[PDB]
């Protein structure tokens, strides 16, 4: 039936980037359906001080009056354990992003996954604040010689030692496999949460996107808006995501990775950029999801409760408690989300119609 | 510097689009290094008459004198036997090419390889006179169904067992697996040699592209200039393309599959169109890979011999007696190959550098 009652959504994996592209995108959470929203620094130059993430959060408040942010810090070589502890302690982040170098847009001043000996004093501060470690999980291209090859379709399987590794050495930490796209992954989630029936134990969680719930390879071959990193692999990749989403279990939850670029930026011959844009309609995208499932009584827990229980978000940071709701009414999606200047986004799933619409109540 | 005579080249796969494309690319297969071109009958409408290959040749001929042409049908329901029997008897074809439909470019007027059946009358005629099938190796994507699913990356080891029973029903039918991609396709075809010495003997023989010995999924990931069918696959199966290319095996010979494409063609945002251009540096682009694999004495008959060998090409046919010649000149590869007008082509390895070139030297 229709008006599911969804409470304060989440969106725990947004770029919003900066400038016109701000003045877009960040109302557009909202329209989506999304109160909460996890702010991604891989901006240029990447957000690695306290001055910066301050004015940007203050920035996006000022176009998103209603919307919840929490910020984060990009995993750098410019970060220190003392200035974890100073933007935790004044409340301006809630967790640091690690970007591959060079595995997707704006990771070229990442780390390197194979050295993670180096930025061990900085998750060492970050599980004395309680903070939240997002990992983009894939392991850079190699190809040179005997080690193993490792592409752009197991480069997350590979990645998984290095998560298992670090949730030893780290073990109160909260980790957070962003965007999973294999079935490997959701494999090595389900084995670290062996035996927490307990909500608010689980420590390592893995976000699923809206595009990779819907993608495979073939989606994206032929047509750069479809390509983000990870890529869609294969459908028995997809039918172990789509199982993993509608699962209801607390460590997995909704980040919709909602990467906004020109569409100039994706027409290109070479160097297409990633990122699928879902911003728009991020509610209604996974609703299709669950319905199609039979299981739209675990929309609530997937969007909403496993998001604001792992960030442990309280009332008394939601900017607006305003509440989501779901109402089965169709729409179609625009075939082109511009903003009457320069800028215009090919969204996703541009043209498909959905089943349904979000709209907001608030609370009294 | 050092030469290599190479006598009469065998490029067995060739894209010629009509209008202005056509009269670029086609000087384009002589400046190439390659004598003998087989011509694919992917245009817009496909090519099933006899009235339209006839003139097709002609125009071909118009625009490279030199170049020695074997034309081909398109395989659709539009073909009867009595078509067959009288085009083979004018040498207007030498052989046709299966598409199935919805699988590459100009795919679409196309058939179904899971019913290969209605198509029979076809290949008894073809069987008779002396005619080459052609095959396009991949099962339309299927992500559905009872059956197991079918992707870019599984299509092509999908398609083997329709190669394998049509190998069967016409025994001394000769059938060329065109562009194989996969490893599996390779053994597939080691196989069906098991017992054949003496190169006469080989009936099903398989093509292999100059891109294919050099891309994998990262290369086309993000660059829908290297986006081509079928896809480029894992190193494991870019290993072993490259093994058999220069094995020296009479059922491997040089099929490029130059896909030319404008470049605003390339550079879209959805339905990018696939294929690769390698005509311009045709044979650099195989000298360079049996050069870093220390074989260049069976690059002859991977290029020259056992082309010839299997499709029969008589010397009475040939239009121009020069030999190509391959002289260790290095050359930098083109950003663009222009008519000058309205038509600019990003060729394969735009940019980078080859250790051989080809020049042409008369007989006797
Ligand atoms: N464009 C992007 C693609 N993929 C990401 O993870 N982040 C981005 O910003
Ligand atoms: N563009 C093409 C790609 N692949 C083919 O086999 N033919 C084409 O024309
Ligand atoms: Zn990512
Ligand atoms: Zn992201
Ligand atoms: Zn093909
Ligand atoms: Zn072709």
């Known amino acids: 039936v229709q008006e599911i009652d969804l409470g304060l959504t989440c969106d725990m994996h947004v770029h919003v980037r900066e400038g016109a592209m701000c003045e877009l995108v960040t109302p557009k959470i909202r329209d989506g359906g999304v109160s909460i929203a996890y702010i991604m620094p891989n ?109 752009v379709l197991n480069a997350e399987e590979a990645f998984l030692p290095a998560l298992k590794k670090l949730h030893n050495d780290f073990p109160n930490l909260k980790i957070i496999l962003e965007h999973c796209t294999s079935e490997s992954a959701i494999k090595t989630i389900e084995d670290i949460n062996k035996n927490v029936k307990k909500a608010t134990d689980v420590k390592v969680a893995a976000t699923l996107t809206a595009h990779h719930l819907f993608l ?28 993993a989403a509608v699962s209801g ?29 879902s911003q728009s309609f991020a509610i209604p995208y996974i609703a299709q999801v669950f319905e199609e499932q039979n299981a739209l009584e675990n929309l609530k827990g997937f969007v909403s409760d496993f998001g604001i229980s792992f960030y442990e978000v309280k009332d008394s940071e939601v900017a607006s408690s305003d509440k989501a709701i779901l109402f089965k009414k169709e729409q179609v999606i625009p075939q082109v989300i511009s903003d009457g200047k320069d800028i215009s986004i090919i969204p996703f799933k541009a043209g498909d119609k959905l089943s349904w619409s979000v709209r907001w109540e608030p609370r009294l």
């Open 43 to 151: 901006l240029q130059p990447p957000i690695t001080t306290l001055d910066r993430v301050i004015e940007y959060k203050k920035t996006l408040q000022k176009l998103a009056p209603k919307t919840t942010f929490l910020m984060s810090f990009y995993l750098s070589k410019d970060l220190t354990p003392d200035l974890i502890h100073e933007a935790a302690q004044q409340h301006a982040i809630r967790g640091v992003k690690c970007y591959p170098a060079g595995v997707t847009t704006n990771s070229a001043a990442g780390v390197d996954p194979n050295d993670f000996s180096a930025f061990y004093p900085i998750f060492k501060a970050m599980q004395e604040e309680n903070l939240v470690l997002n990992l983009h999980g894939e392991k850079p291209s190699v190809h040179d010689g005997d080690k193993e090859p490792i592409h």
């Open 216 to 243: 495979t390879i073939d989606d994206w071959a032929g047509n750069p808006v479809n390509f983000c990193k990870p890529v869609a692999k294969l459908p028995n990749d997809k039918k172990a995501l789509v199982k």
């Open 249 to 277: 279990k607390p460590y997995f939850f909704f980040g919709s990775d909602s990467a906004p670029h020109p569409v100039q930026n994706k027409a290109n011959y070479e160097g297409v950029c990633a990122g699928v844009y």
